[PDB]
Symmetry: C3
Subunit: 37 residues, 3 copies
């Protein structure tokens, strides 16, 4: 009962979310360090 | 193959919640900078 | 069309984003608690 249109859409979305989250892990590691001052 | 549209619905929800939380953390981080 | 295995693979990718995310939340919440 599940089309390839929606499944593929969702996998693209998930992939974009992955790359965004790479950037964000970068920012949070940036912020955490240098949080000693 | 095994589809289970209800299952896909659950995953969609999960993705929406995850996007929401993500929005939230981008927020809290961006603010945290001094 | 259909999935089976493909759906599993996607769910594992989402599960991994969820976990990374939760790590980030722990972190930013700790820093937030350091005020």
């Amino acid at each position: 009962w599940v089309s390839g249109e929606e499944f593929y859409m969702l996998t693209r979305r998930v992939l974009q979310l992955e790359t965004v989250l790479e950037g964000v892990v970068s920012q949070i590691d940036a912020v955490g360090s240098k949080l000693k001052m």
